[PDB]
Amino acid sequence: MNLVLMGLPGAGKGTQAEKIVAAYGIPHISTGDMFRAAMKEGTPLGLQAKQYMDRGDLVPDEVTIGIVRERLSKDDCQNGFLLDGFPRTVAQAEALETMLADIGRKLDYVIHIDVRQDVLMERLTGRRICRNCGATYHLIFHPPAKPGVCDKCGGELYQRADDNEATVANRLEVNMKQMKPLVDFYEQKGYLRNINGEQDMEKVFADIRELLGGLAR
Numbered sequence: 403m404n405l406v407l408m409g410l411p412g413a414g415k416g417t418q419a420e421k422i423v424a425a426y427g428i429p430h431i432s433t434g435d436m437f438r439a440a441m442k443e444g445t446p447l448g449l450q451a452k453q454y455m456d457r458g459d460l461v462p463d464e465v466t467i468g469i470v471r472e473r474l475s476k477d478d479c480q481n482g483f484l485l486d487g488f489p490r491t492v493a494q495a496e497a498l499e500t501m502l503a504d505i506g507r508k509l510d511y512v513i514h515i516d517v518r519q520d521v522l523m524e525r526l527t528g529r530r531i532c533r534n535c536g537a538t539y540h541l542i543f544h545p546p547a548k549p550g551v552c553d554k555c556g557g558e559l560y561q562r563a564d565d566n567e568a569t570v571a572n573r574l575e576v577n578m579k580q581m582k583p584l585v586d587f588y589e590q591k592g593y594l595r596n597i598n599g600e601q602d603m604e605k606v607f608a609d610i611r612e613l614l615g616g617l618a619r
């Protein structure tokens with residue numbers, strides 16, 4: 403099962419990816435997470451990606467495609483995989499097609515989680531993450547038991563660097579211009595499936611699981 407989760411910033415990609423991989427046991431490949439890992443390790447790519455991520459811009463295609471190509475060639479991707487946040491430009495999508503062909507694979511579905519921009523704004527500015535364990539909360543939609551305290555480990559909650567309103571507006575703008583044309587690109591290939599992301603988390607997952615069920619049928 404080869405899947406792509408596509409959505410504008412804050413659509414719920416990570417939230418759903420976690421539920422999907424827990425049910426199937428396939429790897430979760432997130433370009434955003436890979437860039438963050440490189441930043442922490444202090445690698446050349448991490449240092450370059452930091453400047454773009456801090457401003458809410460997209461990391462250049464050549465570099466992004468390169469890290470995905472290296473990740474997909476590993477044996478742990480034999481049973482399938484879930485790409486989260488890649489591709490996000492037409493160039494990345496064209497590259498993904500041949501990258502997959504070279505390893506004898508084809509995408510099954512490109513799941514587009516659709517959410518209105520005004521809602522996306524709120525999804526992101528109110529997000530709080532635990533500094534200790536990475537648990538995610540939301541001040542409006544899913545708050546912690548006690549303010550600024552993680553329910554799981556007691557850790558400090560904080561706001562991601564790129565989640566402030568000004569950076570979010572740039573993120574939504576650039577992703578809208580670059581990612582939206584992908585809806586047409588994948589509709590033409592027949593891989594595109596739309597999911598209404600403005601529903602409670604379990605219902606969004608149910609819609610997704612219903613779609614994935616057609617693969618066993």
Ligand SMILES: Nc1ncnc2c1ncn2[C@@H]1O[C@H](COP(=O)(O)OP(=O)(O)OP(=O)(O)OP(=O)(O)OP(=O)(O)OC[C@H]2O[C@@H](n3cnc4c(N)ncnc43)[C@H](O)[C@@H]2O)[C@@H](O)[C@H]1O
Nearest residue numbers: 411412413414415416417433434455460461487529540603
């Ligand atoms: N391919 C690429 N090419 C070039 N550059 C790239 C790249 N990929 C990455 N990058 C670079 O790296 C950066 C970061 O990438 P990335 O980390 O991938 O950021 P993103 O795509 O903007 O999206 P988010 O992670 O912020 O949100 P999400 O959709 O996963 O939502 P979540 O599930 O947490 O949910 C968000 C919030 O909403 C809440 N929530 C989720 N679902 C619901 C729901 N149904 N109802 C209510 N609340 C919900 C959650 O609790 C949470 O608080 C990019 O800006 C760019 O610089």
Ligand SMILES: [Mn+2]
Nearest residue numbers: 415416417434
């Ligand atoms: Mn994410």
Ligand SMILES: [Zn+2]
Nearest residue numbers: 532535552555
């Ligand atoms: Zn925690």
